[PDB]
Design a binder for this molecule. Structure first.
Ligand SMILES: CC(C)C[C@@]1(C(=O)O)C[C@H](c2cnccn2)[C@H](c2nccs2)N1C(=O)c1ccc(C(C)(C)C)cc1
Length: 559
């Protein structure tokens, strides 16, 4: 069937849309070619709709069915709990889109009567009505990128706030627990960056002759069929479940997940969806389960040997045993034809790699650096172009989410995050005296409230101590970074070093947590380095639940 059906009414914005980077002193000292940075808007929506609208092809075979059964068997060991109204309300982001029924995120979090009452009515309706399609809003996503030597806006689809609270009650424990039980070590969202690098490296070193590749499914969400969504539900139904939870999952699957009507911000009927909605609780879990099922079965069909998967929603990387250059090329092609039959056609044809570092998964690649003792240490990095563009954008315009904070945290060991992101943002936070003001950022889709002064502890936990002492980065990594800076008009690294020295001094002056940042975050700036020892508060702070599962589009806020 058609992934989408359009009525002709437009995908509209509910406010003016900024698309260009402003000329601002604060952002200009970081990136001067401001005209190369842009934000996607509703104006490019039709170009996206055209690409995601097509008739799906799907042929399932024995390998597919065999793999499904194996996954269901594992799912059978799971017992998921129904979340209470209070618990579900506490998981709602403070700025989550308000309901059209007289209440918003604040009311939900405060458990106001109007909100709590409407949520119950929505829940009771999910138990009684098993068929009526639930309404959804479709908006053009606003994302920042650097012009190419332009990307049309992605489309987000989500139901009303009331429905989202009910999704949590019925499925939060499931999508946070079942993926791991089913896919095990292959479930990407259970790993912190350090653990992910470790899994990649170990998996690669465990093969007698490693060969790996990333597989880019063309517009994954639109390739998800009705059958895929029901197969997904069949996996959830293997869990021990409260009666109402079971009915809720059954109703939600038929009324929301398999598809439904699309309404624009103006309240007009845009058309119909018969594929994955980006903005529902099960999207990350569902996509991970679906991608893993299709890939695992595809490997068998292509005759790939000892395929080890690493899946994060639609992002997939495979590491297996090589059988020769030609043999691998052919088997990879067979794998791709198998995925296409399962309705997971490639965006760009996959390529076999015999160098772990030449593989990009989750927009990142493994690279090598050395700690204080000169010992080799693996870490995850990526082209810094988009992160830097977004950092500049977030510097000139105040944004709800701070991808720069999320990037410092997730890419702390990288050359670019330490010398550029840390230096730039800490100098500004100093000037504005806001080092202790908590900010919002996202990690694996979940919203987090973090204070800049806690970065040191946070980084030690997610990356270890070497994150503050890495040096002697690889030439490729250094050249990619330098090249990127020249392209964007970002001052050269030597300039950042000079700026960091000044930032570190001011930080040490204020002593306290500020000084801790100066010592750990900028130890790379001073030639006479300071002996760095484990941070006291580091091995204490509660970081549990930080890397358990993905919730991209799931409207989740971890408190
Ligand atoms: C600002 C950023 C930190 C937040 C973000 C997310 O909330 O999902 C979006 C980002 C982003 C950036 N550009 C395009 C798309 N998304 C990247 C991604 N999310 C999914 C795939 S890449 N990511 C991560 O959390 C993330 C960062 C590093 C790693 C590792 C180093 C551990 C791989 C893993 C996840």
């Amino acid at each position: 069937s058609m992934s989408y059906t359009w009525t002709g009414a437009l995908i509209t914005p509910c406010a003016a849309e900024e698309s260009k980077l402003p000329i601002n002193p604060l952002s200009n000292s970081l990136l001067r070619h401001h005209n190369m940075v842009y934000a996607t808007t509703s104006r490019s929506a039709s170009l996206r709709q055209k690409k995601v609208t097509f008739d799906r092809l799907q042929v399932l075979d024995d390998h597919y069915r065999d793999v499904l059964k194996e996954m269901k068997a594992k799912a059978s060991t799971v017992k998921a709990k129904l979340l209470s109204i209070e618990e579900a309300c506490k998981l709602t982001p403070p700025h989550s889109a308000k309901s059209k029924f007289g209440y918003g995120a604040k009311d939900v979090r405060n458990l106001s009567s109007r909100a709590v009452n409407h949520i119950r009515s929505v829940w009771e309706d999910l138990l009684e009505d098993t068929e009526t399609p639930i309404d959804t809003t479709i908006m053009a996503k606003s994302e920042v990128f650097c012009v190419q030597p332009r990307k049309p806006a992605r489309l987000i689809v989500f139901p009303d706030l009331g429905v989202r609270v009910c999704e949590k009650m019925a499925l939060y424990d499931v999508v946070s627990t079942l993926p791991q039980a089913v896919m095990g070590s292959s479930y990407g969202f259970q790993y912190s960056p350090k653990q992910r690098v470790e899994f990649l490296v170990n998996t690669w070193k465990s093969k007698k002759c490693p060969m790996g590749f990333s597989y880019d499914t063309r517009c994954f969400d639109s390739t998800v069929t009705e059958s895929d969504i029901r197969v997904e539900e069949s996996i959830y139904q293997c869990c021990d479940l409260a009666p109402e939870a079971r009915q809720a999952i059954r109703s939600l699957t038929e009324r929301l997940y398999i598809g439904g009507p699309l309404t624009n911000s103006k309240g007009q009927n845009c058309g119909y969806r018969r594929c994955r909605a980006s903005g529902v609780l099960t999207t990350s879990c569902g996509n991970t389960l679906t991608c893993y099922l299709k890939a695992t079965a595809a490997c068998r069909a292509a005759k790939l040997q000892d395929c080890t998967m690493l899946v994060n929603g639609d992002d997939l990387v495979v590491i297996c045993e090589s059988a020769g250059t030609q043999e691998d090329a052919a088997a990879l092609r067979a794998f791709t034809e198998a995925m296409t039959r399962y309705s997971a056609p490639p965006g760009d044809p996959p390529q076999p790699e015999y160098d772990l570092e030449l593989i990009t998964s989750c927009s990142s690649n493994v690279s090598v650096a050395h700690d204080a003792s000169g010992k080799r240490v693996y870490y995850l990095t990526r082209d810094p172009t988009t992160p830097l563009a977004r950092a500049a954008w977030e510097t000139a315009r105040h944004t709800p989410i701070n991808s720069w904070l999320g990037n410092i945290i997730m890419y702390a060991p990288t050359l670019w995050a330490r010398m550029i992101l840390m230096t730039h943002f800490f100098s500004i936070l100093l000037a504005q005296e806001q080092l202790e003001k908590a900010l919002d950022c996202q990690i694996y889709g979940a919203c987090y409230s973090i204070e800049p002064l806690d970065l040191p502890q946070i980084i030690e936990r997610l990356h270890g101590l070497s994150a503050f002492t890495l040096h002697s980065y690889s030439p490729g990594e250094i050249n990619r970074v330098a090249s990127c800076l020249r392209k964007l008009g970002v001052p050269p690294l030597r300039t950042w070093r000079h700026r960091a020295r000044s930032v570190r001094a001011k930080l040490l002056s204020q002593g306290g947590r500020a000084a801790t940042c100066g010592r750990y975050l900028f130890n790379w700036a001073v030639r006479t380095k300071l002996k760095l020892t484990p941070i006291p508060a580091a091995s204490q702070l509660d970081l549990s639940g930080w890397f358990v599962a993905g919730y991209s589009g799931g409207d989740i806020y971890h408190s």
